[PDB]
Amino acid sequence: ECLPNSCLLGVHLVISTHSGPQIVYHYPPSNTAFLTN
Amino acid sequence: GFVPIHTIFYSVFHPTEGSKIKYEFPPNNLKNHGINFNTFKNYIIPKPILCHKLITFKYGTYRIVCYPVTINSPIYARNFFSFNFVFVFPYDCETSPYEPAITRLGKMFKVLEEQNQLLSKSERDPVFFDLKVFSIQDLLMRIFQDLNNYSECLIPIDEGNAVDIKIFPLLRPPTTCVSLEDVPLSSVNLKKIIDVNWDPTMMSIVPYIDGLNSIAKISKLSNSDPGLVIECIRHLIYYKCVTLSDIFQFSNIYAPSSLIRNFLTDPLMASDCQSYVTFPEVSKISNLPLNKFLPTRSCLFDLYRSLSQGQTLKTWYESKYMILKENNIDIRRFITFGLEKRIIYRCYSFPVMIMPKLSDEEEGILEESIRNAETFDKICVLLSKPKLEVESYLNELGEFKVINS
Amino acid sequence: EIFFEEENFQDINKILEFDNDFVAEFCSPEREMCNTRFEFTVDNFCFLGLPIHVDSQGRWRKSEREKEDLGKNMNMFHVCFVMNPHLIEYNKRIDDMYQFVVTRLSLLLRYVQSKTS
Amino acid sequence: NRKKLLLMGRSGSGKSSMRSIIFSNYSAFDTRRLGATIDVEHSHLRFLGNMTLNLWDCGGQDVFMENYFTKQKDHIFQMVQVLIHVFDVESTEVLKDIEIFAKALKQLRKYSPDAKIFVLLHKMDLVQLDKREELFQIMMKNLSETSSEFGFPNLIGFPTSIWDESLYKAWSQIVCSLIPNMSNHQSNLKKFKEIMNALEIILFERTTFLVICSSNGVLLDPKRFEKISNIMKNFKQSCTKLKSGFKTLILNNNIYVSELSSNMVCFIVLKDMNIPQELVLENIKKAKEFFQ
Amino acid sequence: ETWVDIKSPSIPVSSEFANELLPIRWKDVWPKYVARKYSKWRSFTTPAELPITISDFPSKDDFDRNFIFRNHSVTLNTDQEQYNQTYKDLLRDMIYMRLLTGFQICVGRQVEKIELSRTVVNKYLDFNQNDAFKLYLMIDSEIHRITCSSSGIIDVERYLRKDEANLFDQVPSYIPLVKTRYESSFRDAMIDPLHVKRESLNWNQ
Amino acid sequence: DCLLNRGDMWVLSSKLVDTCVFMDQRLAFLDSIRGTIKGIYRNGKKIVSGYIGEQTRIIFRSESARLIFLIQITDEMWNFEETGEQLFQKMVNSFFPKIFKKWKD
Numbered sequence A: 001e002c003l004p005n006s007c008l009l010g011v012h013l014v015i016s017t018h019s020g021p022q023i024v025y026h027y028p029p030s031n032t033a034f035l036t037n
Numbered sequence B: 001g002f003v004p005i006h007t008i009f010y011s012v013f014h015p016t017e018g019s020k021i022k023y024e025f026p027p028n029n030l031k032n033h034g035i036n037f038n039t040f041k042n043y044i045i046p047k048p049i050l051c052h053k054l055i056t057f058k059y060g061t062y063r064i065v066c067y068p069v070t071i072n073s074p075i076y077a078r079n080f081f082s083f084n085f086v087f088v089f090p091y092d093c094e095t096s097p098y099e100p101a102i103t104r105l106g107k108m109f110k111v112l113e114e115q116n117q118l119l120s121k122s123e124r125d126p127v128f129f130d131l132k133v134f135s136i137q138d139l140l141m142r143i144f145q146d147l148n149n150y151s152e153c154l155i156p157i158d159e160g161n162a163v164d165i166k167i168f169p170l171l172r173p174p175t176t177c178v179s180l181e182d183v184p185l186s187s188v189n190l191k192k193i194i195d196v197n198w199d200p201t202m203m204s205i206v207p208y209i210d211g212l213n214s215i216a217k218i219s220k221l222s223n224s225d226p227g228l229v230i231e232c233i234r235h236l237i238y239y240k241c242v243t244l245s246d247i248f249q250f251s252n253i254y255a256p257s258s259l260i261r262n263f264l265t266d267p268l269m270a271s272d273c274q275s276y277v278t279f280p281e282v283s284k285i286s287n288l289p290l291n292k293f294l295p296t297r298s299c300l301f302d303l304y305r306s307l308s309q310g311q312t313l314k315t316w317y318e319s320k321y322m323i324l325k326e327n328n329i330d331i332r333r334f335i336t337f338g339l340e341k342r343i344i345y346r347c348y349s350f351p352v353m354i355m356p357k358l359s360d361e362e363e364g365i366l367e368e369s370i371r372n373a374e375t376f377d378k379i380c381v382l383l384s385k386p387k388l389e390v391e392s393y394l395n396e397l398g399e400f401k402v403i404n405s
Numbered sequence C: 001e002i003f004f005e006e007e008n009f010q011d012i013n014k015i016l017e018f019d020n021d022f023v024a025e026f027c028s029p030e031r032e033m034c035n036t037r038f039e040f041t042v043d044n045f046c047f048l049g050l051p052i053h054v055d056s057q058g059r060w061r062k063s064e065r066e067k068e069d070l071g072k073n074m075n076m077f078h079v080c081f082v083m084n085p086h087l088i089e090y091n092k093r094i095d096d097m098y099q100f101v102v103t104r105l106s107l108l109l110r111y112v113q114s115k116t117s
Numbered sequence D: 001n002r003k004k005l006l007l008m009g010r011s012g013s014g015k016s017s018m019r020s021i022i023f024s025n026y027s028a029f030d031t032r033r034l035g036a037t038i039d040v041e042h043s044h045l046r047f048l049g050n051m052t053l054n055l056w057d058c059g060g061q062d063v064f065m066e067n068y069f070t071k072q073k074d075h076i077f078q079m080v081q082v083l084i085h086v087f088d089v090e091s092t093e094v095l096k097d098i099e100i101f102a103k104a105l106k107q108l109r110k111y112s113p114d115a116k117i118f119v120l121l122h123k124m125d126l127v128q129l130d131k132r133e134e135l136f137q138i139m140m141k142n143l144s145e146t147s148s149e150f151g152f153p154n155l156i157g158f159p160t161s162i163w164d165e166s167l168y169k170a171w172s173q174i175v176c177s178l179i180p181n182m183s184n185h186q187s188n189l190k191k192f193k194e195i196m197n198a199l200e201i202i203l204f205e206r207t208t209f210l211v212i213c214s215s216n217g218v219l220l221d222p223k224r225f226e227k228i229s230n231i232m233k234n235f236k237q238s239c240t241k242l243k244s245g246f247k248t249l250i251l252n253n254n255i256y257v258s259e260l261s262s263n264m265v266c267f268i269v270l271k272d273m274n275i276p277q278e279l280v281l282e283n284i285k286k287a288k289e290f291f292q
Numbered sequence E: 001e002t003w004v005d006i007k008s009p010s011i012p013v014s015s016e017f018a019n020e021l022l023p024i025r026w027k028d029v030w031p032k033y034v035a036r037k038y039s040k041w042r043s044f045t046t047p048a049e050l051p052i053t054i055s056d057f058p059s060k061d062d063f064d065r066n067f068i069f070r071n072h073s074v075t076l077n078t079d080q081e082q083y084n085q086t087y088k089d090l091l092r093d094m095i096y097m098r099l100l101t102g103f104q105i106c107v108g109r110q111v112e113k114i115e116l117s118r119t120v121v122n123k124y125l126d127f128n129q130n131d132a133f134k135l136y137l138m139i140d141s142e143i144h145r146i147t148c149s150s151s152g153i154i155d156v157e158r159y160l161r162k163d164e165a166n167l168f169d170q171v172p173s174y175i176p177l178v179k180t181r182y183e184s185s186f187r188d189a190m191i192d193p194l195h196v197k198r199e200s201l202n203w204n205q
Numbered sequence F: 001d002c003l004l005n006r007g008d009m010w011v012l013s014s015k016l017v018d019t020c021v022f023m024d025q026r027l028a029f030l031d032s033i034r035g036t037i038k039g040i041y042r043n044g045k046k047i048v049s050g051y052i053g054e055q056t057r058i059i060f061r062s063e064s065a066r067l068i069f070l071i072q073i074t075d076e077m078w079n080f081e082e083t084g085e086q087l088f089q090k091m092v093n094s095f096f097p098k099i100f101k102k103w104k105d
């Protein structure tokens, strides 16, 4: 398929401090139903 | 092709000594190859949110595919019993065909474990159970060897259960831009492929496929709705058997493509071109005047390159008619061989805007086709009228021009 | 703005029917699975990224006071891209994304973290 | 104010049972359905209104325990304030438990040697009543000899179980070693005790119902704090049935239980039975903003 | 008719006639406007009985094309009224015995249209207020109507559907091989599955 | 767990006239038969409670019934579907265990 399609859904900024891993920032807050369809 | 399996092993969650490799074939393959079951042990036996899913990750140069399964019942110790049939592949491959097989194997063994505890009692250890209320290694050997050699297995594990795995290739879905003006070819003989299990529509489409019937013509001939013909043609494209083409006229703008050098660089193209384009006998069509023994390969190559972007087929045929008469060449077969080998293409005609009284539906679909900038072919198919009548109707409707793209 | 409509919004703590803590857990690998590709697939969801982990020393790469505390306490940061390619183009989409975006972005992030946090 | 707590032990030691009953509000009968903790289960818990507790519920199984001291040694045991090692008296591999504890102490001494080690001899209800104290002392002597070898001169131990109230006392004394401004709380509680002329005033937390401080630090029961904590937990779980939350409780106009703030619950026992309720309630409301 | 004649499988569905492709006897189990996407697992897990009511009835031309006519006249003797059994109890027992075979009580618009082209049709049966009941029952074999009055003379008219050229004689004999659980060899079945049928009961006796 | 005749269903429906019911109401017939009103419909809405009249199409679904299965063993049972599964493998791995789990639930 020569049609360009970058199948992206979101990004995460996961850091690992000494108190455990945590999520700092993910940009798209939409659910699975809107993102996949 | 199918990637061979590198190492199969069977993990299990011991309630005392944790997750470990219970069995592995080939033996000591992971330690010899560098794979360590202390880095990705949290994905093989995960917390019960990742369970019953097709976990697939990358470890170094090896891609690891697994389907972890966790059963929840008070019979087992710690109210859980987790295992995983893990498949390991090299990274530089395609693990797509093995994924449904691994998922179904995990699902089947989950069903058997929920039914009669086939995998938990095989450990012969009462520490897996509450205690208050078949060989896995041979199975792994047979799975690994049969999937490496035959890509199939009928491995028996009990009196009524068998591991039945077949690996199929993955095929691309067909196009959606198939319309009523495209003629379907058939690179395979569709007469001998028909068996009792075919769709009733696809049975009817097969006789009316000869490289010159449009999809609407096939639908009208076989008394079929065009939508189901579209779906059946898509199914035939899906198996790489039917390729679309263009309606052959004598008003077409056929032109050489960038693959016209294939008529010289292919040793088996011109030799079939001599026999293909010739009439079986001395046909009378090669004896009509312009107005009132097999062909040379150089003649065919000169006739292929004689087409141009703007010279219609009528003008080219009436400008070169002695050559196509002495050599006894069928012009439709001559064009069709070039189109099938993708050495010449067609410049489509576009009526962009700037007689008998037709019906309201005809003028409505005419306006809808004009607004969408559809070709002359689609308008001719939808109106069931030739090019001249369509041009006259459009000229009566408004001024317009033809683009030969 | 379509990501924040009422019909297309989810809580911040939930990412695709998974909690934030669990996603932060399984997207934070060990040392042996860091400083390389992290092509993780659950079910039609390729969690892809290039984790950058500190070495044996405090070096990120080799040649308010909560900010300095977090700079001296952080040992790994990960930029995880969620992708859902088709099964026939997985090895194309994931490879081109990692080749053209993720690698360069994570290398620049590691460099700028190494010089000035 | 982030405090990193480590909860280690062997398989089936009941660490997750402690975490569930103390913090996640599960009953003692509801700990049987708990599964096996895989790797480390982090739990960010907010104590009072400023403290947050990063409790690390480690696995405790052989693969996890061997993984902790080899590869994750530079992550688990750094910036650690309190270690809570849980020992099972039903275990038949007590020497392996002591060796695992020695390895944990060695790693903590190597990385963060300013921590506070606490040991809980859990599951001390299957053993008979006559030998509980003797078994606790016998194991505590060995644990103190082992603890003093790898630095750490002090080691406080508690006989704990989920079928009694000793868990509340053990977790209260574990938590209170991290609470800041304890001296100011003690001084203000002593001042309030002198002002109200009370026999003994105890200060709790609203959510976990753990003891924070007491006015004193007729002979009374030395184990009264843990029993009041268990009774208040049972009463809160009973008042959840009435679709509401517990606010106040007055017993014989002598024992006053009231919500001092949004994060603490006061337990006041006065001396005179003739004081009207409104005066005590007004004096409680005056001190509501004082302890904030 | 037990089938609809599709002109060709290659033509598509005309509007939404697929929802009209439902059995007449089981049509009343579905709701009026709830979609059929919900009643998928309910048919598997909790199978539904054949409903008491039927909402279909033959038109005026169907009764004048292929049907016949009979008559009943039943009234309990003086022996049975020694017990507490009146004509209402006999009518209730008769409607009870009309069921358990496949009969369905007719109520709706078509039944009222047939009744007018000859007053109130009933579905249930209350003996306190009403004292004269009229209610129709229909199976593919025969159609019943039961009428009553204060006189106690129960009139029953049955419209038997005539068989079409002996369909049970136009089929060849078919005796398969049946192997049960305790057997070890495929023996021979003792009944023809094709030629066994629910016979028309003698309702007069 | 109780055998009702067709006429018994008719009589029970006749007794359930001019009487309002609601969801999960345990009706009783002859002091032994137990019922459960699992669904009341009106104008396409699943109302919590409704009124049962003379023209109410009341149905009697059975939660304990005799079932007959007729499995076709043909040449297609060992055929393979496009995903890569045999049809009898589907029957013994995804239809029967799911229906037994649903029946137990």
Ligand SMILES: Nc1nc2c(ncn2[C@@H]2O[C@H](COP(=O)(O)OP(=O)(O)O)[C@@H](O)[C@H]2O)c(=O)[nH]1
Residues within 6 Å of the ligand: D009, D010, D011, D012, D013, D014, D015, D016, D017, D018, D031, D032, D033, D034, D035, D036, D037, D059, D060, D122, D123, D124, D125, D126, D160, D161, D162, D163
């Ligand atoms: N009888 C008794 N059982 C206990 C006690 N504490 C824990 N348990 C048992 O421990 C089991 C749960 O263990 P768990 O917390 O998951 O162990 P961990 O994962 O090592 O922390 C439950 O089934 C309880 O029956 C106790 O004090 N007495």
Ligand SMILES: [Mg+2]
Residues within 6 Å of the ligand: D015, D016, D036, D037, D038, D057, D058, D059
């Ligand atoms: Mg645990």
